[PDB]
Amino acid sequence: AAQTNAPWGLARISSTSPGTSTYYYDESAGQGSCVYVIDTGIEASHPEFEGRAQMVKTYYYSSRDGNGHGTHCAGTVGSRTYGVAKKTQLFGVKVLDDNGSGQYSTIIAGMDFVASDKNNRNCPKGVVASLSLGGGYSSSVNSAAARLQSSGVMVAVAAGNNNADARNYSPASEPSVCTVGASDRYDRRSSFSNYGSVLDIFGPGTDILSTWIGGSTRSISGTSMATPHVAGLAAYLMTLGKTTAASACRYIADTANKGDLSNIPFGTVNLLAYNNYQA
Numbered sequence: 001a002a003q004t005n006a007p008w009g010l011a012r013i014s015s016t017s018p019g020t021s022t023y024y025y026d027e028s029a030g031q032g033s034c035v036y037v038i039d040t041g042i043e044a045s046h047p048e049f050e051g052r053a054q055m056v057k058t059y060y061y062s063s064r065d066g067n068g069h070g071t072h073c074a075g076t077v078g079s080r081t082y083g084v085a086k087k088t089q090l091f092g093v094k095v096l097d098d099n100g101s102g103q104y105s106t107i108i109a110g111m112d113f114v115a116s117d118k119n120n121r122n123c124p125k126g127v128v129a130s131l132s133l134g135g136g137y138s139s140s141v142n143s144a145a146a147r148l149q150s151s152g153v154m155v156a157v158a159a160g161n162n163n164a165d166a167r168n169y170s171p172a173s174e175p176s177v178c179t180v181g182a183s184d185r186y187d188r189r190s191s192f193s194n195y196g197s198v199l200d201i202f203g204p205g206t207d208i209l210s211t212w213i214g215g216s217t218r219s220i221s222g223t224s225m226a227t228p229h230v231a232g233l234a235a236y237l238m239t240l241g242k243t244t245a246a247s248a249c250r251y252i253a254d255t256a257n258k259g260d261l262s263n264i265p266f267g268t269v270n271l272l273a274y275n276n277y278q279a
Contacts, residue, residue, distance in 0.1 A: 009204025030085025033235040034123035039070030042092035048079035058094035066098030075211030076228035082210040084232025108144040115151035126238035130231035131157040132224030142174035154245040156231040158223035165196035178249035182226040189263040203229035203273045
């Protein structure tokens with residue numbers, strides 16, 4: 001399938017070169033997979049989600065996304081226009097308040113929630129969780145992400161936006177999950193992207209158009225935007241049967257575009273997420 005005039009990041013993930021604008025992908029499109037977006041919520045009524053999004057859990061007075069961040073990330077995973085995996089099921093877990101903040105204890109509870117809640121959902125092609133969040137190093141936060149991954153969920157986490165080594169941030173620094181840095185449309189490391197040996201992969205993160213609250217759209221930047229590209233890619237590849245939740249991060253790294261990014265510090269992987277779809 002071909003989506004013309006796609007957001008640059010979608011075109012990038014199906015291309016061997018920057019500078020194109022059509023996204024190419026297998027029409028299976030993540031059907032039968034599920035992606036949890038652990039964030040500020042999801043405006044599931046947005047026409048872009050086509051009834052495929054729902055809130056399953058909140059720790060606050062509402063499950064609604066009063067911020068926009070979670071809706072934007074969910075849009076990059078799975079919206080009809082802005083999403084990588086256009087037929088996946090999206091499940092929102094609101095661990096962040098409407099200012100975008102959340103206690104680590106709530107975030108941990110949300111990860112353990114997903115590890116159990118997947119047993120209440122129909123996801124025959126597999127389960128992914130996208131975590132566009134983080135703070136300073138915490139062994140307990142890393143352990144929660146490790147448990148979620150161990151339970152059979154492909155966990156993708158943001159590297160962070162500090163232009164620093166991600167070893168000092170959580171859950172970015174957890175070895176067993178997929179830690180995602182950000183790139184721009186010219187294949188440069190995004191100016192804010194964290195780096196370091198703990199990164200597994202880069203995805204599009206600068207000037208990413210996606211869904212927003214109030215039935216709208218906007219373009220924002222962050223490793224928060226790169227992470228759902230990778231989460232959606234994992235769901236898409238799992239639906240194709242090419243990989244599993246336990247092996248998808250390694251598979252994405254195996255099949256990435258290699259050596260094409262600029263300003264990657266010595267010792268950080270130079271790998272850009274790529275669907276290897278041959279139309």
